[PDB]
Symmetry: D2
Subunit: 345 residues, 4 copies
Amino acid sequence: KDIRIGLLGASGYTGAEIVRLLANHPHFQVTLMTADRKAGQSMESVFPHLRAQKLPTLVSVKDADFSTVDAVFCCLPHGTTQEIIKELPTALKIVDLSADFRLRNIAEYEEWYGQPHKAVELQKEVVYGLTEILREDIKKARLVANPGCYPTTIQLPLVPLLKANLIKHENIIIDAKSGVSGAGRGAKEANLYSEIAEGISSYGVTRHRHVPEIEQGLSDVAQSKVTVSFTPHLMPMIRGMQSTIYVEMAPGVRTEDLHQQLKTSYEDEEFVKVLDEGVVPRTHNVRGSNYCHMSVFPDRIPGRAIIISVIDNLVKGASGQALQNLNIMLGYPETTGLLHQPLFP
Amino acid sequence: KDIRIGLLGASGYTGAEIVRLLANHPHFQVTLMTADRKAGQSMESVFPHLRAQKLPTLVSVKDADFSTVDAVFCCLPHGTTQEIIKELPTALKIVDLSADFRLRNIAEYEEWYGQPHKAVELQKEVVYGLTEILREDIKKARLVANPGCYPTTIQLPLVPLLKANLIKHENIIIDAKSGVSGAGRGAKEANLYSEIAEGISSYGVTRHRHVPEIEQGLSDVAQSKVTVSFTPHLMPMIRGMQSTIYVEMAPGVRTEDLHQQLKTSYEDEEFVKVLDEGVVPRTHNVRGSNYCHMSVFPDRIPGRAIIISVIDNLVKGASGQALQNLNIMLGYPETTGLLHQPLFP
Amino acid sequence: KDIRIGLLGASGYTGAEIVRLLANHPHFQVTLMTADRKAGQSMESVFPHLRAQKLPTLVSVKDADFSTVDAVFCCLPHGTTQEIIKELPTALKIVDLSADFRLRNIAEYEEWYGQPHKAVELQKEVVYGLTEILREDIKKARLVANPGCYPTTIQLPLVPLLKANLIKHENIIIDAKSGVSGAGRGAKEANLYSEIAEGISSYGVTRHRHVPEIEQGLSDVAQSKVTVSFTPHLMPMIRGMQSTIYVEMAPGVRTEDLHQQLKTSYEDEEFVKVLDEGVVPRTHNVRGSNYCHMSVFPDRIPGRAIIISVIDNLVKGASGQALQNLNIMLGYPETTGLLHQPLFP
Amino acid sequence: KDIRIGLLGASGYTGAEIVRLLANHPHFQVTLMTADRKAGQSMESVFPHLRAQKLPTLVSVKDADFSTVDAVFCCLPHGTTQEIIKELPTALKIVDLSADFRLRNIAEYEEWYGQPHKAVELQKEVVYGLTEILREDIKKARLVANPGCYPTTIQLPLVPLLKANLIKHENIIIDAKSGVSGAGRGAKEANLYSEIAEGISSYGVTRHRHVPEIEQGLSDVAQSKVTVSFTPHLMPMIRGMQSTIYVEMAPGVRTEDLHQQLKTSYEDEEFVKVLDEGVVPRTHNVRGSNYCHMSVFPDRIPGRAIIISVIDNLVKGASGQALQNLNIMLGYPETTGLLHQPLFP
């Protein structure tokens, strides 16, 4: 095909999704795939579900000439991406699914990710990949830092509201949920079927790494420092993500106003659906898709409102959005290869 | 076994749990079971997993005679409990698992249920069955309204904290989660394995019938009306529940105080357990038992705390606590038959 | 788009699957749908996961104008399919997902379904929709009976083997499994999440309607009446379907011969993959795709072999195969709208 | 209270299960516990759900003296047990839950295990722990080999049937299914929730370690070499196990006879249950507890029948029978501390 894709760290779930999504993309084509321990192996022996496809052999990052492709999808772990990306060709449009360029504050990166920022310089040219919000900058960006799943369900619904001054910036409490696929494919005892199902549990209480990402974006729009609470929970399900967002509306504002602002901000946006007031979204309905459904409800507390936002954490919350961004970055229609219908039931 | 037990409405999940629980209870024996459309059938017919024990033929409550019965576990379908209980022979210890005798305020009951209260006078002698809290009243109470599942996880950690003014009573936000077993065994579209599996949903938003039961308690301890923001979330699992609670500490108060307070209130309690600092509880760890685990964490927002309380929605959230009550309501050790240890994995 | 699609009975998983499969289909675009029990309602009110699509409002069968459609997919309720289809307009390609036109022997239809065939003559022009095996007739048929899900897993690897007399037709023992989605969306106790989750059980032991359908296809090749043993099992999962088949090898035959025959028979087939010897299939690998995988292994019992055939029961086991049949009936590319990559994880 | 019990190999799910079971055993109390790899840690730190239990701190086998305990349960890894049980004081009653003493034929041990046997002589005084079949030998015995999971569900129906010459011992084909809890807590990619959920799989095809164990049990009864076909299947669930068994009845034998025979054999059995003809058992019926169900069904194939047996793979399929065996090795009632009722749902 017309476009050769470089996919770093292809043995993980987001890599697998990058392979699945590109499969029905009439333009792009995976020609180079990187893996660490599984190098020197057909991805078939890694992800047999992809057997209908004929892909390249997995090689190590060290053994790969990046002059091989046009654009790069980076799905490597946080803290291993900065020195790699900085050492990549300049004529390469890049979309790293990792969090090594989402935060502009160098010191902030270090305090939350435990080590100095390596590509301090490159950083300032990076655009945050929240498509429906920064589309214009994403279009002309060379390097894009695909957002994190959770932060995606938060900013999309909250940004427009804060921009319209429809909600206060203080006391925003976020109670989020995610399938265990968000934990990755690492062979950890904690993630076994017997340690995930038939029970639920919180995690990342207080100091969760998605906090600065959330607060940054909201601060930009509120033009003031925003401090929130964020308590994610781990579900005995594979795919899906929901954030139950408890906010205080601005003086004199009613849920109807929040609903209208959201409805107006996303009325022509394919991937963001604002449900009719009162309607409850289910992650089941966006599962295996790139869509995000959101709804507005009154809080039993005066002046407060309840926002619910759901996505398939692996798609709109990962590789789906990444593809969405590369699409426009390369000048192709934004929805190319992104119109899969939900796999419900 | 000297105590003869009557189970009114044995074809549901609460009825089944009662039978299961009493099976190895040293002093209580099920001698009477009633069902509506199952009258005439054996229990094994309805619930075949109970086939190891001898149980009485299922008769109609209308033809039941309490001459040789000594205590009642009423699990009748919301709508007939009110009148059936009023007309029950006065001279026993009736543990009501329905919600009909929970609210002390007739008006509130009317409001939250539309229909008029049908046993206004008897309502005055009912005691709320949140054991650890109202133990002394329950031991000598006639009619006991067993708390609802969610309310149990909410009041246990909060009542102590309010009684000590360690946390403010306003802006208490509860983001609760529950397994689908709490939706009973009714044959409905939204309860089929296919519909429920994978994914969660926010049901009963803004208003849910547990709200008045929650506020009641909290209000009775705060000596002032309490208005919370409670939100149910259905989990793709059978058992377990978590009410992640967000509270504002009282001036000068720190997480340690709340931690020490709870640590001291349930210190010698067999069922309420407080975990160390920073330890996140899991519903997986209480599944199948009558234990509630609770933990306190600081919220990222200055002055706020986060409390997590988990139980097995059907045990401590229902049939287990009901039996915990009937024990004392009969003069036995409060833990008799309730020592079942978690079924993990 | 070129072809207008008529879907009768779109309120079930079959119809939802049709609608999902046709969403990104370039030539066929649904424009008519029926669902008496929900006529006038929106598709979003039945299957909200389809909200990104704009579909015609649901109608009644007696109201739909079957002259406005070029092709139809039939999901009528078993027992009501014959009359509706037999009376369907003249010009029209028809694919029935029901089992009512599968059996080519009216006598067997009655003794297995308890009712006479109401479209005897029409039955004669019907071609069994097991694609890879009957493609030739399918292309020129006007009315196709889409096969059952289980029967597909069995006939696919067995027909080719029986062809070349590689296996005896005596004592073919089948042990299959399907996700509960095969039970449909009917609101019944048996299929409640709490009743199905975390457990399995056989069903349809000894006798089961798919039996005659399976034997019929195998009988075609064996040129002799085949009598099998077929046992269904209900799996605690939504989609997916596997068949574990135990067969006797004919004199002189080795497992390698069965493998070679299958590899040769399906080497060009897009949707039927024959795995390498010793490799085990996983329904997880053909979940949400039209893809099918199979593998053969030696039995510990000398002379016997094992044949595992997996599919997504909602795809090749139903609608996926349905569409595979219509594509070629209308002379379109058989793979059109059917190359969806598996959803994994 | 009286008997002091230790626990060697208190690390996997079988160890945690033994403790759960003894947690309320009226006459046996756990006073010792080994977990070398994790010695110096609290049992809770490994299994938080056991927090309510006051348990002995984990000690190394090296640092453990077996004069304080009266009997020992062994849950050590395979290939490590023979040496330990080798050097134990005969004043100890022992129950090994490993595979190390199940097969009497030393050669077979080495072939199916890759390593030499290291306890020839001792192996001669070992009794096979299928309690309801070898009870008498188990009582008057010191050492006991606790049967495997699958082998238990198979030998229970077949042994009595073969003993009464009611079924032929040729072509015995078993298609088994098991929850993923049986694989253990080991950190394996394959057993992650994201890899296991919503899909089943076959494994141990043709050859599986339980094969020799199963055949030895059946061969000893039939008094002839019995070669079976046995194919395990991994279920996306925690507990539960079913071995659908296809056999051929003896000349002039009807399913009525097999059924009627199972009745005689297990007429006064608390744990094994022969269901009424036509009733299909479900792993949900005995899940959590130490029960199993099984009946006989006619096959569609001539002189064949389909037997189904279910058990929770962790209880009667592991630590439950072990205790059943020890109770009678110490002279206490066989049901002592094993009357736990199924946790259904």
